[PDB]
Write a protein that binds this ligand. Structure first.
Ligand SMILES: *[C@@H]1O[C@H](CO)[C@@H](O)[C@H](O)[C@H]1NC(C)=O
Ligand SMILES: *[C@@H]1O[C@H](CO)[C@@H](O)[C@H](O)[C@H]1NC(C)=O
Ligand SMILES: *[C@@H]1O[C@H](CO)[C@@H](O)[C@H](O)[C@H]1NC(C)=O
Length: 146
């Protein structure tokens, strides 16, 4: 198989906060926050799916590298046709997160949890408890958190 060079540096803050530092020691990092807080609402222009979630990082600088990193992150989930979480892009210029990933479905939550447990290791399972669950994806600055 082919080996991608755009592998981030993972670092887990806590059971609900995770960072993927951009490859080659980038000055940025993808921030992943597991939270039941809904910040975004369906709009005619912001609906996305796993296949074009990269379009939630359009106005960002080094958008190519961001797309490569998100591609690495979603390997094994985007190819799955039974992994259909609602994804809402956000207006980063208005202070909103880059993407909101609806993981309310027990199976979608389970898939995301297992991918992140392969990446970061053991942490609290968010799908045990029911109710709304989201993964907020944003781009933050690297301040040597780890
Ligand atoms: C996890 O880390 C974030 C970021 O530092 C912090 O704001 C939050 O309070 C922490 N959450 C818990 C459950 O301690
Ligand atoms: C992603 O593709 C779907 C159709 O497959 C479309 O509805 C949506 O607008 C696309 N996402 C973006 C951000 O353009
Ligand atoms: C997430 O999905 C659930 C059911 O699939 C739905 O009730 C909820 O409204 C969705 N979130 C948003 C912001 O639409």
């Amino acid at each position: 198989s082919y080996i991608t060079p755009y592998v981030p540096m993972p670092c887990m803050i806590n059971d609900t906060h995770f960072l993927l530092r951009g490859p080659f020691e980038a000055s940025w990092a993808i921030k992943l926050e597991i939270t039941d807080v809904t910040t975004l609402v369906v709009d005619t222009d912001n609906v996305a799916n796993p296949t074009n979630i990269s379009k939630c990082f359009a106005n960002n600088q080094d958008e190519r590298l961001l797309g490569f990193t998100m591609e690495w992150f979603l390997s094994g989930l985007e190819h799955d046709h039974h992994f259909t979480p609602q994804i809402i892009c956000g207006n980063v210029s208005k202070g909103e997160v880059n993407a909101q990933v609806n993981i309310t479905m027990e199976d979608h939550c389970s898939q995301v949890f297992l991918k992140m447990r392969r990446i970061f290791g053991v942490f609290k399972n968010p799908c045990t408890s029911h109710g709304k669950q989201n993964v907020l994806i944003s781009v933050s600055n690297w301040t040597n958190q780890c």
